[PDB]
Every structure is written in structure tokens, then in C-alpha cells.
Design a protein around this ligand. Structure first.
Ligand SMILES: Nc1nc2c(ncn2[C@@H]2O[C@H](COP(=O)(O)OP(=O)(O)O)[C@@H](O)[C@H]2O)c(=O)[nH]1
Ligand SMILES: [Mg+2]
Length: 178
């Protein structure tokens, strides 16, 4: 053949501003956590990645909020969404229900979702835990996944790199498995 890679997968990352969408993408693609400048949106990025028996062409689309009441081009052609909220922001968790799930039901009804809790390094910090009465536990994260019908739930930290690869590996596997 003239093409050893025959599957393209468009993976769009969405969720509230400042939860860590862009850093996840920089972490996954570069194996580095940015310490100075972080762009609003990661460059549109595409690369071959090996998942199981396969090499696929992964296209990563980053997003940023807009005040737009027209009722997004970036969603067109999406095979899977990574829907991020921060493990230390209740508002971002509640916005998955109030903002993001409504948006995705309207604009991308049949597209699966990988639900991602970010900033695991903060949520799991014992100092943080000791001072907060009502923490977003893995249990609450799994309850959200269930409520929204997401394919998987993953907790990660771009800062320590924990489970970042798992996010996009799982996104790919959801698309490739039945
Ligand atoms: N502690 C910690 N901070 C993070 C992590 N990911 C992102 N951040 C910080 O969270 C803020 C927002 O990150 P960014 O990726 O720009 O979020 P985005 O608006 O969703 O794209 C920045 O100051 C990042 O340094 C993480 O895993 N752990
Ligand atoms: Mg960003």
C-alpha cells in the first residue's frame, strides 16, 4: 500500500477556562509541563500515535470560551470529546452539567466523551484535603461520568504527568473499540 495509517481521529478538548486543557495537550505531546508562557489554545496538532495493534493519525483541537449567543466550528468532524473539569473547582464540575452537556447534546449528539478531572496533584495533596470539607472525590467524578453518559472517567495531573497519556490513549480506544 501507499498508506500504512488509514484512520484519522479528531479529538476535541473542551471544559471551563483555566481547568488545564492546554497544559494537558502540551504535556501529552511534549512530555513537559509549561512553567512560563502558556497559550490560550494549543496549536492545532496532528501526529501518528501507536495504540494497540495500530497506528492512527490523531488530530488534537484545543478550545477557549467565547461569549457567543448565536447558538463552534472546532466541533465539526469530532470523533470524540475530552471534557475537562478541575478536581478543585466545584463550579467547573457543576458546569459540566449546566453548560457543557447541554452544549454537546445540541451540537454533537452522537459523539462519545472522555470525562477528565484535572489537577490531581492538588486534589490528592493532603494539605489541601485537610482544609476542605467537601472535596471532589474519585467517587463524585465517577457519579458525574454516569450522569452524563461519558465512556470513561480519568483523573490526571499535567504537573506530575500522572495519567495524561491515559487520557488520549483512552480517547483513541473509545473511538476504535465497538
Ligand atoms: N497544579 C497544577 N496546575 C495546573 C495543571 N494543569 C494546568 N495547571 C495550571 O492551571 C492554569 C490553567 O491552565 P491552562 O492549561 O491554561 O487551562 P485551560 O484554560 O483549560 O486551557 C495554569 O496556571 C496552569 O499552570 C496541573 O495538572 N496541576
Ligand atoms: Mg487553554
Amino acid at each position: 500500500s501507499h498508506m500504512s495509517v488509514s484512520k484519522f481521529i479528531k479529538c476535541v478538548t473542551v471544559g471551563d477556562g483555566a481547568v488545564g486543557k492546554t497544559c494537558m495537550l502540551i504535556c501529552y505531546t511534549s512530555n513537559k509541563f509549561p512553567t512560563d508562557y502558556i497559550p490560550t489554545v494549543f496549536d492545532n496538532f496532528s501526529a501518528n500515535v501507536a495504540v494497540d495493534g495500530q497506528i492512527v493519525n490523531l488530530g488534537l483541537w484545543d478550545t477557549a470560551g467565547q461569549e457567543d449567543y448565536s447558538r463552534p466550528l472546532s466541533y465539526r468532524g469530532a470523533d470524540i470529546f475530552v471534557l475537562a473539569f478541575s478536581l478543585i473547582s466545584k463550579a467547573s464540575y457543576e458546569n459540566v452539567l449546566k453548560k457543557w452537556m447541554p452544549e454537546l447534546r445540541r451540537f454533537a449528539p452522537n459523539v462519545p466523551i472522555v470525562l477528565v478531572g484535572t489537577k490531581l496533584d492538588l486534589r490528592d495533596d493532603k494539605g489541601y484535603l485537610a482544609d476542605h470539607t467537601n472535596v471532589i472525590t474519585s467517587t463524585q467524578g465517577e457519579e458525574l461520568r454516569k450522569q452524563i453518559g461519558a465512556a470513561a472517567y480519568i483523573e490526571c495531573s499535567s504537573k506530575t504527568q500522572q495519567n495524561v497519556k491515559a487520557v488520549f490513549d483512552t480517547a483513541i480506544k473509545v473511538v476504535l473499540q465497538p
